[PDB]
Amino acid sequence: LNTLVSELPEIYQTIFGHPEWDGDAARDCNQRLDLITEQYDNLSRALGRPLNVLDLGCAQGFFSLSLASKGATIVGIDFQQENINVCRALAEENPDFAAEFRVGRIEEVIAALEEGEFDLAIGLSVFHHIVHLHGIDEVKRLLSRLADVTQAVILELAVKEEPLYWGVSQPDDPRELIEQCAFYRLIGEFDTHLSPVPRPMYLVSNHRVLINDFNQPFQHWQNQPYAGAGLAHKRSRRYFFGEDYVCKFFYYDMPHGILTAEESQRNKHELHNEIKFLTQPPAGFDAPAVLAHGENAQSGWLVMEKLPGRLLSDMLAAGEEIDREKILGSLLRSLAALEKKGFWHDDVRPWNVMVDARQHARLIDFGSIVTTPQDCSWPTNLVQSFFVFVNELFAENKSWNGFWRSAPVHPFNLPQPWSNWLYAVWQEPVERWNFALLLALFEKKAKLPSAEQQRGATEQWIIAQETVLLELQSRVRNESAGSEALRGQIHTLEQQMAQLQ
Amino acid sequence: LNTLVSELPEIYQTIFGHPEWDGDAARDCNQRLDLITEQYDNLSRALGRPLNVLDLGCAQGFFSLSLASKGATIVGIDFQQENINVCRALAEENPDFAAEFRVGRIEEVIAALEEGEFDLAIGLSVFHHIVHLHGIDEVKRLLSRLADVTQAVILELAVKEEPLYWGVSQPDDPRELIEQCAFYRLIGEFDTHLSPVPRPMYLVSNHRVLINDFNQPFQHWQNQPYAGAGLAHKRSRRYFFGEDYVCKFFYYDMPHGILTAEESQRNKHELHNEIKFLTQPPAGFDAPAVLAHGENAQSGWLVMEKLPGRLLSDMLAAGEEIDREKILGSLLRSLAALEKKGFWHDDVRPWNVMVDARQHARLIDFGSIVTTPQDCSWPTNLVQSFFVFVNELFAENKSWNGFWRSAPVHPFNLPQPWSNWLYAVWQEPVERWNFALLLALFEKKAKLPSAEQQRGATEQWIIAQETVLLELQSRVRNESAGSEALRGQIHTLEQQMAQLQ
Amino acid sequence: LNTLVSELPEIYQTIFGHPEWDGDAARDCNQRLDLITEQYDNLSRALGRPLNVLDLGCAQGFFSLSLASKGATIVGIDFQQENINVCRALAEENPDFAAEFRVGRIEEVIAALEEGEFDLAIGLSVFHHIVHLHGIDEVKRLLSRLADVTQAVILELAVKEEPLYWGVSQPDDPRELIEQCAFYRLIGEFDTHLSPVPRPMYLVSNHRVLINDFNQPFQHWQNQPYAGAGLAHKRSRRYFFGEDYVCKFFYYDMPHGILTAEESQRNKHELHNEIKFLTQPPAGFDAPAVLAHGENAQSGWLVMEKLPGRLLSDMLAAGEEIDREKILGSLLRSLAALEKKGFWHDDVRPWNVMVDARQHARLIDFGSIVTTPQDCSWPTNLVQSFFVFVNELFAENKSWNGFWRSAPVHPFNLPQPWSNWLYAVWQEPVERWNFALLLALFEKKAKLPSAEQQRGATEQWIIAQETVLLELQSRVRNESAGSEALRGQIHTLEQQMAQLQ
Ligand SMILES: C[S@@+](CC[C@H](N)C(=O)[O-])C[C@H]1O[C@@H](n2cnc3c(N)ncnc32)[C@H](O)[C@@H]1O
Ligand SMILES: C[S@@+](CC[C@H](N)C(=O)[O-])C[C@H]1O[C@@H](n2cnc3c(N)ncnc32)[C@H](O)[C@@H]1O
Ligand SMILES: C[S@@+](CC[C@H](N)C(=O)[O-])C[C@H]1O[C@@H](n2cnc3c(N)ncnc32)[C@H](O)[C@@H]1O
């Protein structure tokens, strides 16, 4: 037994149960255990039972046994023989610890898994040898399917910047081996004696949100804020669904090359604005409660209430008849309340609304709640953006896309009587353009003058021009798109020449 | 004789004179005759003499003889021998019928023709064998030159959707074999016992309009409404000239694939509007009389007076000095009369006008006479379109093409005193913008204020912007055109790869 | 001696000293001398000493000796032998004439030169044989480096349109062999007995301005009026620096193919306007004096004072903080004075200004001093152009390039209080829009109303639209540029096919 232990070749781990060889070969080992433990406990409590564990690359089966010691089933895998023998023997020493173990190569043992066979897999300082053998492209799929078959995988990756030969083969950033998955958070990081460049400790999943505290599953997930949002935020923002919750996860740091100052800073700013607003807000609304908020080294995480109903942008996208009025009424009521307080929401656009059987329209993305000044992103000085939004709301007119979306400002196309409402607001001087005014005008809009008549001169002229402008922008988009497509195809051909040479 | 008749191989036709073999082999034969007869009679009366006839593919010379029986010269052609022998004999039975006949292959007998040798050619159930032998591309030229050498050709084409082997070679639409010619109308159609898919009966010409009643020659013809109109109407609209008449011919149905609902419907709507207007119109104009109107299954035909003078668009296109004023005066006078009645013409554009030695401008295309509402196609609410038109009229400024033509709205560039006229109209509220007002202002425009002075602010600003806008549209057109050209060239290259593979 | 002279083969020149062979072989020779002399004298006086001379291709050393006779050092070069022998002997006849001479081929004798070894080189009827041997591409460099190593080169070129065989090899325009250099002026031209097509006489330099009278060196030189001016003037306009002077040189005639009527005429018009203005101008400014003005057959030359300080466009281009106000004050003061006189400057744009420690802004390019009417090139009726210019002045906003530069018209973005100044001007009717008004408003602008408040309606709307417009133009520029680049690359490929065939 003792003899078989030394027969062992390179004691990477601590042998579990006796401390006599802790002095000889090793790495720290015991700390990593502590964090994994924390994670296990939190996870298990959250679903409501003990868990199945996969110690992919276990060596001396240290981690397995230490987990099995707390009511866990482990099937530890280390392809080389001696490491397994001794750890299976270590398994027998403490009979109550349900751990199986076997010799075999991880790649194929992963292949042979089930959608929910295991709840947890461990990949501590193991894959860097695999990727050296196979390649980045290969390994990525293993891990991706590993997240799919389990429910949460924790890994410790060796970075390319290490002395050992294999280093050169692995990716400059170990984060490249995980990105393909849904959730990933930096739960830890450890320094190596090899070089002053430490190896990180990541946490993944393809079914659940795995925060410090909030460990709940999601239904669907993505990478963009809304339908037709694009690349606007450099693939950095992540959005997770949930039956009763919704999650935001912005990264402050990205693989390879980077979110420039402004982007990183702004999504940092955005979150910190949101959390500081949602906790301690004004009076007179039905705003969602903070379900979970928190920050990490490179990553900033937020979770809130999955408030009811669904988005307008997608409604208009289809055409589900929405009562034009009701949404506006509620929005204005709250909006007024806000204008009163001294706050403001700059992005008054149709991608920020909710609808139910009462159509009580409430906003989303409270990171746009700008306190001090009106401004928006485009139509300067709010009220105009609101006009656009109103045109965007009514709509039923072609499909205009000007980068700086979309519909005409001004009511004249708007049917009667809103037509009139807005012309009345319009007449007035800009200094009086506060939302308090609008709502009031909004309310007694039925008694307002004919609008469409008092126009003539200018005001007709510009209607004709506003329609011309969107068509122009609208086309520029398409020919610009043709141009961008060729820019993309031209890169390929430049590369191709080198391949052909 | 009788013996030679049966010696004959396959009695496709009825032998002419005796009814004894009408029972044996056949196709109906006698009906087709009746329609051809009608057509001959109408044609002959219209020019004022009997006619030369070409029975291309005659078989038993039935049709020839039946035509020769009414004072016609026929040179019937059937390449195979037996069919000719018997029909020449049938020719001799009735000596007074001037018909020659000979054995030879149609293709070469067509080649040997003269510009006005024949007045009529018959191609009843014959070419489908030719196109099987040669091909669609080939046959098209035969027919095209056949229309050129004669004066009217009637054909009966076998459609590709027929059981017989040759079917597969012919075009899915038999209308593809004729389109290259000037005039074509569906004069009939016949069902075949082969399959429940009938073979049509078309009527062509490259010199004359061949209506039911109106059978008059034209000088020149085309496919587009005006110089620089484009593909806007899917090659469906045809326009025929004439020394004293003008013709319109819109198709409700096209070869291969199709005028979508809107296009078919709109050109149907356009005609039906025109005929319903020109007959029973308002008071106070010099409008043209209906020379001929009528409808067919797939085709809608209209003919009216070739009213005098010539178009303005082409005048401006060159530069023939037109008295700026006179045209406007008359146009307004009638226009006013119309506004008064309750009617309206929406397309107040320079492609719709006439000019003589008195410049009494009158419109064209009475399918744009929209009764109820002002609107136009672009510059909304007429009066503005009129402004554009006035700028379009004066002009002498570069060459602006914005899709939504072209010139600035507003008079400020317009020289004095119209400058003033329009600023005065402009000042006024839009609700008062009726043509009745304009004419009156038009008349006393000499006594109007300085216009160009009272501007300042806005009104200058927008002048500068209006000039910018056309330049922008104007360029977008060209780079858009470059883009469309590459889209066209790219298709070719995609195809090319398949050819090269 | 006399015997050696006839031993000579072809007496192209006159033998210097005796007139006995002037009758036999020759070309005129003596006239060319007279012009070269003039040039030498003027040059020498201007630097303040006698000069070193290179008689590249000298034949009978006539010109050399004639120059050496006036205190010049000559190293005459004629590759063929006999011509040198006799001219070295002619050199010895008049011992006081410092001339060396040697046999060798010009190309290599040029190679062996120094930056300031010689002050003058002569290339009279010599290179056409070289270019026949080598080629246009080759010869151009010889001459280019010849201008660099000397300080002024005069040449007489044989044009391609000559009977002699070599003609076919030389360029259709002999001006093609010089253009690469900095300065070139047509100082003369001579008819040849060969054909009624004369050979010209050009004067070059790469260090100095070589006018009739003004023979001063420059520091730097170019081809475009300012940073980012482009090809706008067909490579015809040349601009020469100087420690105390500045030079303009516009060509009325260009190599190959040509400055069309308008371009030639306009740069002729531009100069003649300038000289007629700068001499006999209005009162109330600090305008520069004419240092030298004059005209030539194909070339129009002007030189004026290098007035102090530097350009604004390049200041803004970098960002050297300029006192927003001071420049405006002075400009307006003079501008007012001008408006008063009855004159005007149409191109009120930031590429036409100067700055010092007092920022007393004064204009440049007095060829834009249009007397009678306001107009500019774009923003019609001056005052608006001034608005643009003011926006262009303040700036600090992105980088807008609309062809018709650039910034918004109108003050509303302009900070306070100019904001107000311009709204006040704006309010007023256009007929009152003279600069006299503006300055006065400019002065008491501190006491003006709030501007930014009284807006509302329209005036806000158009602010939003003005920003949209520049972005649109701004993009059109880039995609237009992509398009133009492909137009350029496509030409190459069309050519390539012919090369590949
Ligand atoms: C360095 S250890 C770390 C073990 C454990 N994850 C830890 O951190 O305590 C990695 C172990 O996995 C094994 N291993 C490496 N590549 C493997 C593969 N493709 N399949 C199975 N085991 C592998 C090695 O034998 C080695 O003992
Ligand atoms: C089916 S028939 C119809 C005859 C006649 N057009 C009618 O409908 O009563 C066609 C006849 O034209 C002849 N034919 C076919 N191809 C021909 C060609 N290329 N040249 C001359 N005759 C041809 C055939 O022999 C056949 O008898
Ligand atoms: C026609 S002459 C003119 C001489 C002198 N430039 C003049 O105009 O009085 C040109 C002379 O230069 C010589 N020459 C031609 N090509 C030359 C070369 N590549 N190098 C040196 N000398 C050359 C010829 O021998 C000839 O005598």
CATH code (residue C277): 3.30.200.20
> Which ligand sits nearest to residue A139's alpha carbon?
1
Considering only CB atoms, A472 lies closest to which of B427, B473, B483, namely B473
Query: Does C488 map to a domain?
Result: no
Alpha-carbon A13 to chain mean position: 36
- Among B129, B146, B202, name the best residue to mutate to test ligand 2's pocket (greatest count of ligand atoms within 8 A of Cβ): B129
Say how far residue A405 (Cα) sits from the centre of its chain.
24
Inside any domain, residue C477:
no
Other Cβ atoms closer than 10 A to B185: 20
**Domain CATH for C36:** 3.40.50.150
Give the distance (Å) from ligand 2 centre to CA of residue B80: 8
Q: How many Å from the N-terminal Cα to the C-terminal Cα in chain A?
A: 62
Sign of the alpha-carbon torsion through B428, B429, B435, B437: negative
Centre of ligand 1 from the C-alpha of residue A11, in Å: 12
Does C374 share its domain with C226? Answer: no
When computed from its CA atoms, the radius of gyration of chain C, rounded to whole angstroms, is 29
Tokens in use for B176? Answer: 């593809």
User: Which of A14, A34, A79 gets mutated to test ligand 1 (max ligand atoms within 8 A of its CB)?
Assistant: A79
Structural domain ending residue among the three candidates C307, C324, C345: C307
Instruction: Please state the atom number of ligand 1 nearest to the C-alpha of residue A57.
Output: 12
C-beta separation of A198 from A174 below 8 A:
no
Write the CB contacts of C320 (distance below 8 Å, at least 6 apart in sequence): none
Q: Ligand 3: residues within 6 Å at CB? A: C 12-13, 57-59, 63, 77-80, 83, 105-107, 124-126, 129-130
Domain count of the fold of chain B: 3
Structure tokens at A461: 């002229």
C430: nearest CB among B455, B468, B482: B455
- Rounded distance from Cα A324 to ligand 2 centre (Å): 70
Position B196 in a domain: yes
Is residue C1 domain-resident? Answer: yes
The rounded distance, in Å, linking the Cα atoms of B154 and C146 is 84
Q: In what order do the strands lie in the sheet with A290-295?
A: A221-222, A237-240, A245-251, A299-305, A290-295
Question: What is the number of alpha carbons within 13 Å of residue A392 lying toward its C-beta?
Answer: 25
d(CA A229, CA A405): 12
Residue B457 near residue C427, CB atoms below 8 Å: yes
Contact B44, B50 (CB under 8 A): yes
Q: For residues B391 and B422, give the distance between their C-alpha atoms in angstroms, rounded to a whole number.
A: 11
- CA neighbor of A64 nearest in space, from A45, A36, A38: A36
B346 and B336 assigned to the same domain: yes
CA distances from A427 to A103, A385, A421, A439, C378 (A): 82, 17, 10, 16, 32
Q: Hunting for tokens 């398994």 — which residue is that?
A: A91
Does residue A293 come out as left (phi exceeding 0), alpha (psi in the -120 to 50 range) or beta? beta
How far is ligand 3, taken at its centre, from the CA of residue C271, in Å?
39
**What residues contact B258, with CB distance under 8 A and at least 6 apart?**
B264
**Beta carbons of A68 and A31 less than 8 angstroms apart:** no
Q: Is C74 exposed, middle or buried (0-12, 13-18, 19+ CB in 10 A)?
A: buried
8 Å CB contact of A429 and C464: no
Q: Is A13 in the pocket of ligand 1 (CB under 6 A)?
A: yes
Q: Of the candidates A218, A239, A262, which is a domain's last residue?
A: A218
| Closest among B34, B46, B38 to B215, alpha carbons compared | B46
What CA–CA distances, in Å, run from B248 to B175, B268, C76?
20, 12, 87
| Structural domain boundaries enclosing A169 | 1-218
Residues A261 and A289 in one domain: yes
Q: Do B455 and C409 touch (CB under 8 A)?
A: no
* Interface check A463 vs C, CB under 8 A: no
Q: What atom of ligand 3 comes closest to residue C123's alpha carbon?
A: 6
In what helix (H) or strand (E) does residue C423 lie, and over which residues does it extend? helix C418-427
Give the Cα separation of B501 and C324 in Å (integer). Answer: 68
**Ligand 3 centroid to A278 CA: how many Å?**
93
Our measurement of the distance from residue B75's CA atom to the centroid of its chain's CA atoms, rounded to an integer in Å, reads 32
Q: Provide the Cα torsion C385, C387, C390, C394; round to 10°.
A: -130
User: What's the 3-state SS for B426-492?
Assistant: HHCCHHHCCHHHHHHHHHCHHHCCCCCCCCCCCCCHHHHHHHHHHHHHHHHHHHHHHHHHHHHHHHH
Neighbours of C221 (CB within 10 A): 18
Whole-angstrom Cα distance, residue B382 to residue C93?
98
User: Dmax over Cα atoms in chain B, in whole Å?
Assistant: 102
B-to-C residue pairs, Cβ atoms closer than 8 angstroms: 51
- Residue-wise over A226-263: b if at least 16 C-beta within 10 A, else e? beeeeeebeebbbbbebeebbbbbbbbebbeeebeeeb
Question: Cα(A66)–Cα(A31) distance, rounded to whole angstroms?
Answer: 12
| Residue C452 φ/ψ region, left for φ over 0, alpha for ψ in the -120 to 50 degree band, beta for the rest | alpha
Within 13 Å and on the Cβ side, how many CA atoms surround B92?
A: 6
A110 and A231 in one domain? no
Across the interface, whether the CB atoms of B460 and C380 are under 8 A apart is answered: yes
Please say whether the beta carbons of B408 and B388 come within 8 A: yes
Across the interface, which of C456, C468, C479 has its CB nearest the CB of A479?
A: C479
**C410 interfaces chain B, CB cutoff of 8 Å:** yes
Q: Measure the CA–CA gap between B462 and A180, rounded to whole angstroms.
A: 53
Q: Are residues B247 and B214 in the same domain?
A: no
Tokens found for residue C56: 């590249």
Per the domain annotation, does A193 fall within a domain?
yes
Residue A312 and residue A355 in contact, taking contact as beta carbons nearer than 8 Å: yes
Tokens standing for residue C97: 């004439």
Tell me, in angstroms, the distance from the centre of ligand 2 to residue B12's CA: 10
Q: Name the token pair of C138.
A: 């080759």
Report which of C206, C93, C94, C198 is spatially closest to residue C145, judged by C-alpha positions: C206
B432 touches chain A (CB under 8 A): yes
Say whether both A404 and A269 belong to one domain: no
Decide: helix, strand or coil at residue B351. Answer: coil
- Neighbouring C-alpha atoms within 13 Å toward the C-beta of C63: 32
> Among partner residues B460, B472, B479, which is closest to C381 by beta-carbon distance?
B460
Distance in angstroms (rounded) separating the CA atoms of residues A150 and C413: 59
Pick from C429, C476, C479: CB nearest B454: C429
d(CA B461, CA B464): 5
Distances in Å between the Cα of A180 and the Cα atoms of A144, A145, A177, A385 are 7, 10, 8, 38
Determine the residue among A419, A468, A469, A486 to mutate to test chain B binding: the one whose Cβ has the most chain B Cβ atoms within 10 Å. Answer: A468
Q: Are residues B14 and B161 in the same domain?
A: yes
DSSP helix/strand/coil, A461:
helix
Residues ≥6 apart with Cβ < 8 Å to C288: C278, C304, C305, C307
- Measured in Å, how far apart are chain C's first and last C-alpha atoms? 62
- Which chains have 3 or more CB–CB distances shorter than 8 Å to chain C? A, B
Contacts of B133 (CB under 8 A, 6+ apart): none
Min distance B373 CA to chain C CA atoms (Å): 28
Domain-ending residue, one of B457, B472, B489: B457
Q: Would you call A480 an interface residue with chain B, using a CB distance cutoff of 8 Å?
A: no
B413 Cβ contact partners less than 8 Å away, ≥ 6 residues apart:
B391, B394, B397, B419, B463
| Paired tokens of C448 | 């003006």
**Shortest Cα–Cα distance, A423 to chain C (Å):** 9
> DSSP 3-state helix, strand, coil percentages of chain C (rounded to 5)?
40, 15, 45
Distance CA A197, CA A190 (A): 9
* Domain match, A209 and A258 both: no
Distance separating alpha carbons of residues A405 and A397, to the nearest angstrom: 14
Q: Establish if C436 belongs to a structural domain.
A: yes
Q: How many residues does chain A have?
A: 501
CB A76, CB A69: distance < 8 Å: no
Measured distance CA(C469)–CA(A292) in Å, rounded = 45
Q: Does C379 touch chain B (CB under 8 A)?
A: yes
Q: Which chain A residues contact residue B472 at CB under 8 A?
A: 472
- Nearest CA to B152 out of B219, B218, B205 is that of B205
Distance CA B10, CA C274 (A): 98
Distance from C-alpha of C193 to C-alpha of C338, rounded to nearest angstrom: 57
Question: Which is nearest to B147 in space by CA: B115, B106, B124?
Answer: B115
Residues C348-376 as b/e (b if ≥16 CB within 10 A, e otherwise) read bbbbbbbbeeebbbbbbbbbbbbeeebeb
Contact A339, A348 (CB under 8 A): no
Q: Which residues in chain A touch residue B427, judged by CB atoms under 8 angstroms apart? A: 457
d(CA A461, CA B462): 10
- Please report the sign of the dihedral spanned by the C-alpha atoms of residue B18, residue B20, residue B25, residue B29: positive
Instruction: Compute the distance between CA of residue A399 and CA of residue A412 in angstroms, rounded to an integer.
Output: 19
Instruction: With respect to residue B491, please indicate whether it lies within any of the assigned structural domains.
Output: no
Question: For the domain that residue C409 is a member of, what is the CATH number?
Answer: 1.10.510.10
Same domain, C435 and C356: yes
The three-state secondary structure class of A460 is coil
Resolution in A: 3.9
Interface test with A, best of C410, C474, C479, C489 (most A CBs within 10 A): C479
Q: What angle do CA B6, B9, B11 make, to 5 degrees?
A: 75
Q: Is some CB atom of chain C closer than 8 A to the CB atom of B404?
A: no
Q: What is the DSSP letter of B178?
A: T
**How many helices, marked H, and strands, marked E, lie in chain C?**
14, 13
**Length of chain B, please?**
501
Q: From the list A460, A465, A479, which residue is nearest B381 (CB)?
A: A460
Residues C318 and C439 in one domain: yes
Considering the domain architecture, whether residues B153 and B226 belong to the same structural domain is answered as no
Q: Is residue A277 part of a domain?
A: yes
User: Is the same domain home to A1 and A112?
Assistant: yes
**Is residue A83 lining ligand 1, measured as CB closer than 6 Å?**
yes
Residue B4 burial (CB < 10 Å; 0-12/13-18/19+)?
A: exposed
Subunit contact A464:B426, Cβ cutoff 8 A: no
Residue B51 pairs in a beta bridge with B72
Q: Where would I find the beta strands (DSSP E) of A150-257?
A: 153-156, 183-190, 199-205, 208-210, 215-217, 221-222, 237-240, 245-251
DSSP letter assigned to residue B403? S
